Design a protein around this ligand. Structure first.
Ligand SMILES: ON(O)c1cc(Br)cc(N(O)O)c1NS(O)(O)c1ccc(Br)cc1
Lengths: 169, 169
């Protein structure tokens, strides 16, 4: 579909800068795009569809805008860490959102990620695209970093499929 | 079952001295217990149903009974490091297997795991029980440790369910 390819060219294509790496993942979901997007868009509640989140805190006066932040307490490695994340992009009409990890996540330094939600018709189904660019830690190989980031995104997208399909019922 | 409770008593109960924690998880599978066991028993190939395994290698003269070892490279996001895991127990008649993590930096300390697979009716279904005991060093959090381990095991058990249910459908 052209809308898909246009989204990939605008939001999921990347420069191959040195010490950087990126990837793009896709998840078909048997649920309407509005439901999937209503979950995907809530920057303050990523635990609804992500794994390994002990908790996520936002300021007492939180309002979702570009530049708003969250603290994500992560327990996917056992000295728990607090990922500091910043909303880069939110467009409800285009169903696109994006965030950055500014600090607190030594495995994903200068992580930047974009998620887009697409409608497909035949029964109205959804395809979610999720991509990222991130530093390769100097001692790391690229494939280690991508393997880690890919594995996590794949599991989270599976959980998102599962929870939105249960919602749609 | 009586068999289920006895297997729990024998293999999934632990003593509670602090600096150690334990947990039991259950997974229900709509597949025959011999199929599930045929998968679970494969000590040399945990990549079949476990997440976060980049690779797993065994000696060229490998033979699988108690005391043999496997080398697993874990997808942790940290620099690549090989871990050594040891087959603690294996009974094909009782459908019980178990292993210990004996080596590996930035891994869990003294992690010990046991998996039993149980027949059930009331078309044949299966319950898989998996438990672990693991260290919690005086600086670490037991809450976080159980969150981490339980999430991993629950994901692995879901993949095992999916894979064994795909077999012969
Ligand atoms: O799944 N798995 O082995 C794993 C997954 C991620 Br992500 C990171 C790590 N490291 O190495 O931090 C590990 N290794 S482990 O923490 O020693 C570990 C052993 C058993 C159980 Br249950 C949970 C964790």
């Amino acid at each position: 579909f052209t809308q898909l390819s246009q989204s990939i060219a605008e939001f999921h294509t990347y420069q191959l800068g040195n010490g950087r790496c990126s990837s793009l993942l896709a998840q078909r979901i048997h649920a309407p795009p509005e439901t999937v997007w209503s979950v995907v868009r809530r920057f303050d509640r990523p635990q609804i569809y992500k794994h390994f989140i002990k908790s996520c805190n936002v300021s007492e006066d939180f309002e979702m805008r570009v530049g708003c932040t969250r603290d994500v307490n992560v327990i996917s490695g056992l000295p728990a860490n607090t990922s500091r994340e910043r909303l880069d992009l939110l467009d409800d009409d285009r169903r696109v959102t994006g965030f950055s990890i500014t600090g607190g996540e030594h495995r994903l330094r200068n992580y930047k990620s974009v998620t887009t939600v697409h409608r497909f018709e035949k029964r109205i189904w959804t395809v979610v695209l999720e991509s990222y660019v991130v530093d390769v830690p100097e001692g790391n190989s690229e494939e280690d970093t991508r393997l880690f980031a890919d594995t996590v995104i794949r599991l989270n997208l599976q959980k998102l499929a599962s929870i939105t399909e249960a919602m749609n019922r």
